[PDB]
Design a protein around this nucleic acid. Structure first.
Ligand code: NI
Length: 143
DNA sequence: TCAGCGCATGG
DNA sequence: CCATGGCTGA
């Protein structure tokens, strides 16, 4: 299952192949416009390209990078905690990991695995992509 | 259930 | 000047 390319241009569309990165992106999007978030996301991933590196990071460094986005202190600790649990803890779904609620977990289930028909998002932009799928899904291949 | 985190941007 | 761009812990 490989997600199609929508006009909405969600960042999840290019991060489906890396569940960790996709979920990091969701956290960056927590009450934060992707207009400011996405650029900082690339600066972040360039510094911490994996969960093995992210868990071993010092949060004061990350919050420094997250400063212009707001929610910098809590996210930094969340990102580190989430990264550790993403590796250490045995999950079957990311919601069980700290910092990931329904939105992040619905993103994982639409993009990282094929459960998108079993997914009913409450998020705005996730509903739009989900709708754009249903109409065009048969014109592609999926079912 | 809900305060709280938090800075930018548009309204 | 307020409102909008998710989640935890309590
Ligand atoms: Ni959770």
């Amino acid at each position: 299952w490989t997600p199609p390319r929508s006009p909405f241009n969600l960042v999840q569309e290019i991060l489906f192949h890396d569940p960790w990165k996709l979920l990091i992106a969701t956290i960056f999007l927590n009450r934060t416009s992707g207009k400011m978030a996405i650029p900082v996301l690339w600066e972040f991933l360039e510094k911490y390209p994996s969960a093995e590196v992210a868990r071993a990071a010092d949060w004061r460094d990350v919050s420094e990078l997250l400063k212009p986005l707001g929610l910098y202190d809590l996210r930094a600790k969340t990102i580190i905690k989430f990264s550790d649990e993403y590796l250490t803890k045995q999950w079957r779904y990311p919601i069980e990991l700290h910092g990931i609620g329904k939105y992040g977990n619905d993103s994982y289930r639409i993009f990282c695995v094929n459960e998108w028909k079993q997914v009913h998002p409450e998020n705005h932009k996730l509903n739009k992509y989900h709708d754009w799928l249903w109409e065009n899904h048969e014109k592609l291949s999926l079912s």
